[model samples]
Target chain A: HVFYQKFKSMALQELGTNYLSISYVPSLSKFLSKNLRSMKNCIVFFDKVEHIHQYAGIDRAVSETLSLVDINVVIIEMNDYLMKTSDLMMMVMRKINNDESIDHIVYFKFEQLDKIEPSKLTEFINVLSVLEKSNNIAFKVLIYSNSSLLSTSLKKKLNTKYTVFEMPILTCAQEQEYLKKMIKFTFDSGSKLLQSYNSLVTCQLNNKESNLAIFFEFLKVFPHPFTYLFNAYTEIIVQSRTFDELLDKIRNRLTIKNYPH
Target chain B: HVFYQKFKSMALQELGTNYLSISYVPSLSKFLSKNLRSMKNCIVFFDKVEHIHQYAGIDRAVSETLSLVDINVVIIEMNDYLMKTSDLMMMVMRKINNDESIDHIVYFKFEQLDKIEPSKLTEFINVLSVLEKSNNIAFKVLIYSNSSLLSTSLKKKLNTKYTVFEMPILTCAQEQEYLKKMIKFTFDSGSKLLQSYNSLVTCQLNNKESNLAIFFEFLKVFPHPFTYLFNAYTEIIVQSRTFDELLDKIRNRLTIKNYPH
Candidate 1:
């Protein structure tokens, strides 16, 4: 019982900016609830529905942001419908209208978008712009892959109409706080802590690991990072015999999980 | 001279984003004149007017960005007047209005703005927003400083009305091209080039020196950097009987010039 420690928060704040890495969904969700809760009808690209609950307390923020317009977040799972078509957009719009809720739709990492013709995308934007006029609906479009892959004219028009908001690069202080919690949660058991001291030293030496967003993106899998990390840590601890063995195994796992090459 | 290298460009293209660093005035100017030339009034802040003429062809870009609005860039030199007041803002507005040259206003590093009461700024912005309704005249206000310096309410109102515009961070490739032009111009003459080569090498070793804006800002007490450097290099090259002696003298002069402390 003493060895079992639940994750604690240093109370990292939520993201209120226009764009953020999907890793910060909980923080962002928490932010929307507390700060932008009343602000209405903005779009958020959720890589997965489960992402909202990935972190403790972010569910409320996600709902808070979406609820401002009395709509649930409009998410287009790449797995379900690969390239967004005008028909797909229309269907999504109707679903939102029927549900009568919207967060001005956001498509993050909206890849394979070469599928839609410029005119069709343009036409959809025209309607989206009209919805924005009603004082409730707003629209945000982010082109994650090579933006130039989108037609030049489409890029220009979307650029001219709506400013492409940039996610603020996470501050070191912010990331460090989030990272400390991850460390605390994963290294809870006393033996695991002793075994991982060298790993902690390595982490300190390589500060880029402090970036929670980059670390997650490298995984190319989205979920509660701590939960994923916890499983790995537990597995490594279970198999490895000594401190040296545990550290080496953890190293190989991180390198494999991280440096895909 | 075997080493007459004319500085070149990759023909690195323009800025499409809503905000840019004051350092990239010439790049931005060229960009605006080429693409956004047809667009109406917008304000640009020049931290130091000297930044424009530091490169060869950029004078035209500087003039182009300023003159597009049919007036000299509406300058509020902090040197002349430091803390901005409501009355001061009113005067600047009236001055621009009276000049009959209107623009989409750009407030770049309009510093010491904490001097103005939030209500006054909100009121002024209200009027500016109305002027933008005419379609021909628009407004762009870049709050480059920590925006919290403005009252939270004013910052909110401004955010709501104008979708917060984010600048593309200066890409290394982009700034490299622009910086090459500046290095060429500032080291225009032959002896200047000789003097600058060593300095340029030193600069490259520590690459943040490649940031043209930071470089120019530091060079504000500008004498032709190479002219001063040439004199130093010449003094060393003169006393030294051999290549070995010259290199020795060159190193010392650089150390002394670089590290006075």
Candidate 2:
């Protein structure tokens, strides 16, 4: 009912990682009923579980998943505001009171909200302030508001300390038009990226780090409709292997990362 | 009493010639008998010629002077028209039909008249139009007015064809100050003129008219402010014995033959 099958198939094909979705809580007995003996790291998605009793479902799932997986389970939820806030507060209090291990806290907001009251907004700010005070865990906040006004206002207000981006708005008709234009620009810019990558490869092959820095500096100031393409190209040289290999890898990564999962 | 004066005596003097007063115009025969030849080129002040019959006195003087001197007598009038259109029209018409040679037309208006009537202003234009038709005679129009507006307006109207110049205004107090400055400039420019005159003499001794013409052309383009001094110096050079002696004294013989009795 929660549609974990689509996500499981996507992860396996794209990332070559097999994923499992379970329905029942205290499902260790059910997991053992299957051929699975133990659990490693797992991805969990829940529809809605707002109250404290509903969190029992999360604890049971984590316990069963951890028995098989070495690393802890990653719990993701659909547009559940009460459950999200409660989970965030619980993590912050655990770090303060019990010194519990929270490797990373990835907070996600739903892309749709019919109305956002000021009290809820203040509560959201309070959660972030509390998280900021915690020194134990590395955390990231990802907001997804469908309304441009709310997204823009929050982005501007939280600009310095937060990384904010707007998802492109595309009507059904405009989506196709945008896709065509994006593909054309990508093809054109791809060739330029390839050329720069080749030069960079040549520089590294010739042991010219200084020359490569200069070349990258030149590309920084070069005129373009999309300057971010040059930035991605530069990042590939810093992060990946050979020029062709970097292009292939980043193209794949960007494609999968930006695609609707 | 007849007044027979030499040219050298008349030089540097304001009143260069003599004429009978206009009060004796009714007995013009007696006045003519008394003055006769000495009345040549007489200047009759306008204040002394208030009546129309006063012009008859000037005519009689000119007639008697022409008989004795065998040359035309020029009558210089000091015309003060009081900014009146009728008076200006009368003056212009009388000047056009005058028997005596009218050397200069002096227009003197009081400072209080302020703005000149447009039609009365056109009377001056008409006078200039009439004089421009004459030959072998030069006309000088002198306007005496304290109003700079009237002076500027009159100049603007005359500038289209004629080269109109404003006489520098010098009050009684400023007159001495101006004279001192003028004398200094004149002395400096006079020395330059002398040097040039000496060069011209040396060149003439060497017989270089073309070189002299070239030098004069240079001076014409970048003329010194005191150009009148240079002009007077050139006139003196032309009237000199060295030039006359070198050129076989041709103009001197002609001037002597044509001298007034």
Candidate 3:
């Protein structure tokens, strides 16, 4: 997301007390070197894992860095079918040579699988059960997903063992709050948000905030991903001219084929 | 300018050794508190004075802050007719009562007067002579102008008393250098500038640097003001799709109308 930090804080705030025991591991490779197994009930939350393609280099880097240290970093890319358990075991076996003293942390990173099948969810549960029953190494798993169906299903399947956090898009109130702050920061000190906002409530509202609110309103109507919405809105905002002409132009654009979701 | 700092540094680098002795006074009021008369050959340069309207608050702030300290900040808005020398003197006089011991720094800020008459230039020279000869207060004048004819004329009239510096637009080589740096900063580490730049020279060149260089070339051809050119270019860059489609769209736009300077 474009507003990653804000979204994260919003998620953490929503999580409330459930976020209490969760340690946020930004760099898994860096975190893996430490004696994680000694600490009981070690739960790690990996943020910004919505897009697996974005983390391709990060996955490789984590594998490389952890290979240097005596820690196994397992990345299970979940979709319709799970990676063969024998192949997964082979990857772990290749990393180790002598006695298996190394710790294991599994990253069950789910992405873009909004319509992932229920059979795959059961396959995942069975895979995790198999790893624990094999008892080769102490296992800790962290599931990260943006899909409503997938995340909710996993939590429903194993709610006792997992914590599910659903991060919805920004509310109208939240959007307005952010918009006010942005206008204040972007404009001159004299262009006060409170004054313009009050004016917007009143009729005499031909100011930056009012103009911005109108433009923001247009973007809000056509539902899109948060990044695409804001990025497109920013493009519109930058190249703006006379208010009437700009609004007309935007209206004409929306009249064309709808923007791809 | 969108790239103000880079443009400024390029200007300074062009000036080379002349920039060494010059005391750049960013804030005139802040600088005026120190005793300026005791020092011989005290010349100050005020930069970013191309647009007087943009610095409206800055002018007011300078006036307010200088009134607290005992110093006269003179802003002579030059056009065809000079502000009457008596009126100028009155403004200086109003700031002082008993002893005219306070220092005065003249800000001869010239803006949007590209077609200013030569008679006004004579008026300026005579006015400065009167200020020096009147023996009201010790004076130091700093002239700032983006107009080539005006800056050159002022320097011609009082070259012995002034230093003239012209800030030209970025050269083709300098544009490419800045563009390369910008592409490197904007793209991922794997999308290296040198590699893609080399590739642009070769046939196989479907990369960030190549795309950026192409976009930059289009902007450069359309000789608009630096701020407008870059701001427009940035907007285009942000909303870009497929290269072929994007190029066609830009071509269609340029075909419609030449952008205002």
Candidate 4:
């Protein structure tokens, strides 16, 4: 949860600081559209595919955010969950096609970035150079890694050709706090709604009206026929409960029948 | 020739007076049947498929020597050539399962063995120990790498479960000498035969001579017509110039027929 909080804060900070802002969008778009963009390749490099599941929410958030800006995202999951020489080359090739709008590429490797050495970084740069010269695709690669060692070496190797970003490691306490906040935003909200209903029943209801209220309560408690029917259908035919359990509770709640009701 | 003489002398010097008096077998069968008698499931691990070519002579020599001793050899070529984490695990699993005679497992990696850190070594050992306990496989892994750093770390990490063998790094001069010797061997043996006769002539000569001679010649000029023809007929088609070029050359040469002249 600390990690999540740190990432969220960093992302929000970036957004606030106008990290995505540029005065050169028109020129950049024109350059990219005409294949005149110097850097036209993008590499979304994952350190390991296993980490994808671990950081799936963050990745999805980042991807969704980028998509809103119309960035053509290509997700390249590394085999063995770790980036290798071949994967890097293949990614470069895939993104630098003639009609692509991306020239400069940003690559995010989820974990074990320290596994990459100066030689590997140099090799990646060499591949980019070769792609630029041979394919007429100018590419500026940005490598994001959590490992400081990898980031430092990558920065030294790539220098101006690439940029290296290091995300700070979050402490355990901070992670817990972040998790609590997230839970509050999700399940806690629903729990508050239940609390409000109980308070209303306690403060506003009359004892004489209890029998009439019980009938009303029964009507309120019983689900609408269509809703009950749909839930049963979904449970039997689609195994919707399993699907719901698989998803984050907050996300599942958004699509649940009683969400708005 | 001088380099070869020097290498031979050095080898002899290393053997000294304590050299085990053993007869060298000419046939691979004899070699495998002899020294590898105690080896139940011998798993030879390779870091890269390219290593088969890079260290072909060493691999062949070792295989030949081991085979003469009647060792049951099972070669595991790492599909993840760059030594990704999963590939390492996969290789260990293969060795654990199928190689029953492999009381001793040998590992050969293309990169410096030191490239694998102490933690990885520890993790691998931990996995191996668990597997050994569960599967009832008594195994000792022997790792060879040219890097002193890697060998030292590997030794430190492995402690008791395995033995680490350090390969002496050949100096530039030594490497040059080895290359010269190899080139000379190729020229004097394989190249000589190929240059002298056309594909048809070589095929006819192969049929007339002993299979041993043919095999010797084939090894000398392998990936050539004799080897290619043998492999093709035997359903062992490898993508290599040694086989393909020879086949093409033979086909072209045979296509031209001279009448009685």
Candidate 5:
């Protein structure tokens, strides 16, 4: 709720503003569409802001699906760094104008903003400002970043031009709720993994000591650093057949083998 | 054209049959939607047929988009063996009926079907036959496999009930055309990778020694065993800045280090 609920509120409160910033999380890209699916005349661009073109096959396929619904989505993929902010901004502008609708909603996701040159970022911001004020394009920009310093600097530099939303640290209760959602979302009702999870929750009262241990263990893997979670989930599924085995495998994955240090 | 063009023709020539088979290739899954995007009331289920539930997050997001366009697409993920063919078939039958469409176009993708037990495979086929003939559901099945023996045996067993498609080995002309298409599709017109490729084609006359060398070298990577091609493409893009550098990097990636056996 801290993330999607807040973002939805902000999006609904558009308030004639064209730019929105959110603290980046890997899973946001995966779940962004669910939040935006109901909206009409909107196009969401998940751009990685790379130096080299990486028109990801997977993203392209997803883009095709989004386009099927007349949303006109584009995945502007690049591999390493943003070479020219001006050129990139122009490309985005062209994409926004591509559909020729009276009103346009263009959501641009620029990941790892801190990795880009600060001057280029500032330039991009200025470009957006110019487009908004002079050219008067009816569009919005959604920038994603994980860096607090960058967010703070943007807040300072742009002042009233930008609004920032944070994915606040989850409380214990919220963490447990998120974990439940992840488990349910990742597994089907008839899945052995889901049944095992239910058995554990229903068992042990479930024990505070073991429960806390398991909760913290899950925190190490649940949703952040998504690729790690994916690998760990896949490997654990491949190796474990029983609930006890699953528990052991979870702990084993977290523990490291000592080597020359 | 051999893959997509042929598949589209087969799909168009329904011929009152519901089951069709294609020789498996990973790229087909990525490109499948493009071929089917225009059709209405179609729900494509890309099931990997795993033992454990692995309701893939990416596939689910794509499912959400396809769902947006009124296509009831589902990524029925499982992580290993088919626990029960009957149960699985029942689940598929339920999915086909989920939208309550009078004329349903359901496409099911079962990858690496050869790995599944032959008895289970036969049982699943028989179940499908029962459903198609008795239930009288207007749906289509697109089964994928690379195993010739499996295709041969299925052809012998089902005979007229099934339509088999073979993805033939690409001739030199088709291979070059495919390479050009892949290069074009993978990169934008302004992309450095695409430009470098154009430079090579425009530069070497392009040389037969160097051109043939580059073509075969590319053959070693482009569009087959898709994950490998993806990795190689990403790495090459990251490391190479020029055409020669790109050529060198491609050769480098293909070469291996010798270790004591």
Candidate 6:
């Protein structure tokens, strides 16, 4: 179920909604808050790295923001269930119909539809189309990555009501500001926390979408930073008992074997 | 499966990917030619609208570009089978292992795997990871929508070797340049094509990554311009008995019917 949900979201890749700049947009959270207050029913793709367990913190931040503005966000954690859209839609629809003054619905979770059945999606869309036309509720769709995942066909079916928005990529200053708050809370830990932050941030400020929170969460377990390549860093950091083991992992990849010792 | 595939690709959002600029990028083609001649294995995604039977032609253009540079582009006209990545992997591996000169693999259509089983994607990625690391294969993954669909876990497993590249969107000048080529072929179809083209481009120059080819292709069929409210236009186009019907479709939306009739 986790797999299919993830798979389904991928098909709808929003190519260059400039999702990388999501973290930099100062007013996005505010924009969303504004949009939700005024717009009736819109579909948003939180094109962040939320589907992966490690980067799940990013989703929380946005979800938290949504709740702050008085939107009661309800999520369909598709990772937990191999659901039939028919079954889920009925419950969701009933909930929407009965619930008064609902703020927003997190209709689907990021990466939850990777393996969902097509007929189910159609049924789901069929229901969404109906709801889209008639309802007063707004929607927040958490796409694993891209902003353009939903094409004109699906968008058209919903008419001009559903618009796609990307999650902002955080700028270095934003990361510093956010990280400053985190480290200060545990200030007595001092240089130990600060050093790990330095080594953990290997990504250039503008090159890729860098999530300070994800790196912060990951490094929380490690005493030292030995690598920059993400997966290699994670793979080694998770298993290594000592810094030497971490050294060995990087050594194995960089050094050619069957050569002079 | 097509439903899930369509859904995922939409999230991956093939619509605004600006694939049209790709149709014009000389360097990308030149770059592929250079890289392929020196390198080995690759992946290519033909992200055009495969579900819409008429516009399917756009996808073929990119598929052709890859083959022109000498890659074995095998398309799973996903419109055909609910493909199992497990089954396809076995065949793909055998083909690569047996055939000495199979330089690249344009294996899957973009958005082909949106509805594929997550377990199968894992298995396929497992094979791709092995191929990415162990051999002479330099791969290209055409993420129909976006790389986020792959999730960080899968991406990290594949590592830095599998980087995502968003295709370019054509500029207005670029669109004009391309349109000139089309109109030059038949000059007298000028003003009609011109108005349709002018009215056709509803998307902003830069706010969203819009496609000139897609717009070009869409407008080629119509004699006059109308709103790009996709479903409304498609719904009316299919049933229109005459030009009056087409006019009526736009009229119903734009006209204030309560006026003295």
Q: Could you give candidate 4's per-residue lDDT for residues A1-261 as a string of tens digits?
A: 011211221212222122112221233223223321223543333332222212322233343343433433333332223344476776556654436564333333333433344555555556645654554333433233334554454445442433222232334444333322221211111122324423433432233344322322333334332222222222221112232231222222222343222
Best by DockQ: 3
Question: What range of 10 consecutive residues in model 4 chain B has the weakest lDDT sum?
Answer: B13-22
TM-score of each: 0.27, 0.18, 0.37, 0.24, 0.40, 0.29
The interface RMSD values of the models, given in order, are: 30.4, 58.1, 19.3, 32.5, 19.1, 23.1
Q: In model 3, what are the clashing residue pairs, if there are any? A: none
Q: DockQ for the candidate 3 complex? A: 0.05
Residue-wise lDDT of candidate 4 within B41-104, one digit each (tens)?
Answer: 2222223222212232233344445444432333333213324455556766665465555443
Between prediction 3 and prediction 4, the one with superior lDDT is: 3
User: Which model, 4 or 5, shows the larger lDDT?
Assistant: 5
- Which of the numbered candidates is closest to the native, going by highest lDDT? 6
- Write the number of the candidate with greater DockQ, choosing between 2 and 5: 5
User: RMSD for each model, in Å, please?
Assistant: 29.6, 46.8, 15.1, 32.1, 14.1, 24.5
For each candidate, the DockQ is 0.01, 0.00, 0.05, 0.01, 0.04, 0.04
**CA lDDT, candidate 2, residue B251:** 21
Q: Give me the displacement of residue B173 in model 5, in angstroms.
A: 6.0
Report the lDDT tens digits of candidate 6 across residue range B186-218: 111212322333343332222233443334444
Lowest summed lDDT across 10 adjacent residues in model 5 chain B is found at: B12-21
Clash count (model 2, backbone only): 7
- TM-score, candidate 6, is 0.29
lDDT of 3 by residue, B1-261 (tens): 021212121211222111111122333434544423222222233444443222332333333433554444444334324422565455444543434445554444343412255565676665556555544444444444434564456466553355333333456665455433332221112222224423432322234344433555664564432333334433333445433333443444322133321
Cα error, candidate 6, residue A51 (Å): 8.8
Model 5: residues with Cα > 4 Å off, grouped in runs: A1-130, A133-162, A172-254, A258-261, B1-168, B172-254, B257-261
Cα deviation of A181 in candidate 1 (Å)? Answer: 8.9
- Which has the greatest TM-score? 5
Docking class of 5: incorrect
What is the number of residue pairs that collide in model 1? 11
Task: Please write out the lDDT profile of model 2 over residues B146-237, one tens digit for every residue.
Answer: 13454555456553232222223224444323222221211111122324434544444244244333333343333231222222222232
Put down candidate 1 lDDT per residue, B1-261, tens digits, no spaces: 121111100000011010112355445545445433444434333222221122212222332354555432333322123233455556556545644454434322233221245544565556545545555344433232214444354445443232222233344555444434432322122223335554654554355534323443333344333222222322333233344444444343443244211
Candidate 6 residue lDDT tens string, A59-124: 334544554545444445443333434776776666566464644454454353233445555655
